[PDB]
């Protein structure tokens, strides 16, 4: 049985990843000393809540409020919350055309809540990671894997209608789902994900191909960050960020010689994620969600979490998601 510590851990890990990754976003190369300096300063900062969250958390909050209000999953409700959240705080960091989806949802001219997303990228749909960045809560609320898959997909399709976008969301949700189930071995976890993605996807199995590359990298020694960036990616594309977040989580189950030992696994996961550069708040928010689900609140340290905008509201929302989970059993 999943614990409240795991549900809260996952949401706080997501929040930490967003808030701490945000300042580094877009850096083609990050200097790890800069990340470690930032962490040391953060820990000494007298004022609380100085790190603002981005679109990743804004949309996460909307997902959660929808699930709490409509526990059987209501995509119409969820789309409305996405669009209303954007309208309230439009400058949180939305990109890759996604605001056109919200503007169409807000207009009276669209009645099918999936149609705006289908029109993106000249009718091909978005393959960005915005579906995946906000999906962890689906795995926290719904214990049944079939529900996780179908609701991860539908929640993602509200904005991301390309199979790369929505299958990236499914993969992220599945990573959280399997991380909740207890102590894991890396290869077994990867086979769990590969087995599901083979069926879901089946160039033909792009996520499966990246997961197999992860397995190869974990079996290798001394893997430079540059090889991870080159082969898995650090981009806004779901295919170039969801596997990278999974790799970051699995890598950080063990010590990293470049990250001081005083950091716990979850802290290491966030630091390592950010150190890969690129889309740092989304890769760290996704890796942090998985790590939080796995290690729980015990590794969410006071000095880190107090730095984040909306930490109190996040911790409270976990209790309501946990209640949903319990009702599902
Ligand atoms: Mg963001």
| Domain CATH number, residue 267 | 1.10.4080.10
- Interatomic CA distance for residues 79 and 73, integer angstroms: 11
Q: What is the resolution of this structure in A?
A: 1.5
Cα separation, 239 vs 158, in Å, equals 18
CA of 219 to the centre of ligand 1 (A): 31
**What's the gap in Å between 286 CA and the centre of ligand 1?**
11
CA distance 216 to 205: 17
Q: Is there a contact between 100 and 209 (Cβ–Cβ < 8 Å)?
A: no
Q: How was this structure determined?
A: X-ray
Q: Write out the H or E segment, with its range, that includes residue 328.
A: helix 311-328
CA atoms of 123 and 87, how far apart (whole Å): 24
What does the DSSP assignment read for 105-145?
HHSTT---TTHHHHHHHHHT---BSHHHHT-HHHHHH--SH
Distance 93 CA to ligand 1 centre (A): 5
* Euclidean distance between CA atoms 139 and 219, whole angstroms: 28
Residue 18 Cα to ligand 1 midpoint, Å, equals 7
- Distance, CA of 267 to CA of 264 (rounded, Å): 5
Q: After which residues is the chain broken (C to N over 2.5 A)?
A: 202
Contacts of 185 (CB under 8 A, 6+ apart): none
**Gap from CA of 243 to ligand 1 centroid (Å):** 17
Q: Please tell me the distance from the alpha carbon of residue 168 to that of residue 90, in angstroms, as a whole number.
A: 24
d(C-alpha 304, C-alpha 297), whole Å: 12
Summarize the annotated binding site for substrate as residue ranges: 55, 124-130, 160, 236
CA distance linking residue 240 with residue 210, whole number of Å: 9
Question: Which residues are annotated binding-site positions?
Answer: 18, 25, 54-56, 124-130, 160, 236, 279, 281-282
Other Cβ atoms within 10 Å of 205 Cβ, number: 16
Burial 20-32 (b: 16+ CB within 10 A, else e): bbbbbbebeebee
Count up the domains in the chain and report the number.
1
| SS3 per residue for 252-266 | CCCCCCCCCCCCCHH
How much distance in Å is there from the Cα of 162 to the middle of ligand 1? 20
Residues in binding site for Mg(2+): 18, 25, 54-56, 279, 281-282
Centre of ligand 1 to C-alpha 22, Å, is: 7
Domain that holds residue 171: 1-329
SS3 call for 237: strand
CB 105 within 8 A of CB 80: yes
């Amino acid at each position: 049985m999943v614990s409240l510590a795991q549900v809260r851990g996952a949401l706080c890990g997501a929040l930490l990843g967003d808030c701490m990754g945000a300042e580094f976003e877009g850096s083609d190369a990050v200097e790890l000393p800069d990340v470690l300096e930032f962490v040391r300063l953060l820990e000494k900062e007298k004022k609380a809540g100085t790190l603002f969250y981005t679109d990743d958390t804004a949309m996460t909050r909307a997902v959660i409020q929808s699930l709490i209000a409509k526990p059987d999953f209501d995509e119409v409700d969820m789309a409305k919350r996405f669009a209303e959240e954007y309208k309230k705080e439009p400058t949180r960091g939305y990109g890759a055309g996604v605001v056109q989806v919200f503007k169409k949802l807000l207009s009276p001219k669209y009645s099918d809540v999936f149609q705006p997303a289908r029109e993106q990228f000249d009718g091909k749909g978005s393959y960005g990671n915005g579906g995946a960045m906000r999906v962890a809560s689906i795995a926290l609320a719904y214990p049944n894997i079939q529900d996780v898959i179908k609701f991860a997909r539908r929640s993602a399709q509200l904005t991301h209608a390309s199979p790369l976008g929505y299958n990236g969301a499914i993969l992220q949700a599945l990573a959280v789902h399997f991380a909740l189930q207890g102590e894991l071995k890396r290869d077994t976890f990867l086979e769990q994900l590969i087995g599901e993605m083979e069926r879901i996807e089946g160039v033909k199995l792009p996520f499966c191909s990246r997961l197999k590359k992860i397995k190869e990298f974990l079996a290798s020694s001394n893997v430079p960050k540059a090889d991870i960036v080159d082969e898995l990616g650090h981009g806004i594309a779901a295919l170039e960020s969801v596997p990278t977040a999974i790799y970051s989580f699995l890598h950080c189950m063990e010590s990293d010689p470049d990250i001081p030992d005083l950091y716990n696994n979850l802290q290491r996961t966030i630091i390592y994620s950010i150190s890969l550069g690129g889309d740092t708040d989304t890769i760290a928010t996704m890796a942090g969600a998985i790590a939080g689900a796995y290690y729980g609140m015990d590794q969410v340290t006071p000095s880190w979490k107090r730095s984040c905008e909306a930490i109190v509201e996040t911790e409270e929302s976990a209790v309501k998601l946990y209640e949903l989970y319990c009702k599902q059993l």
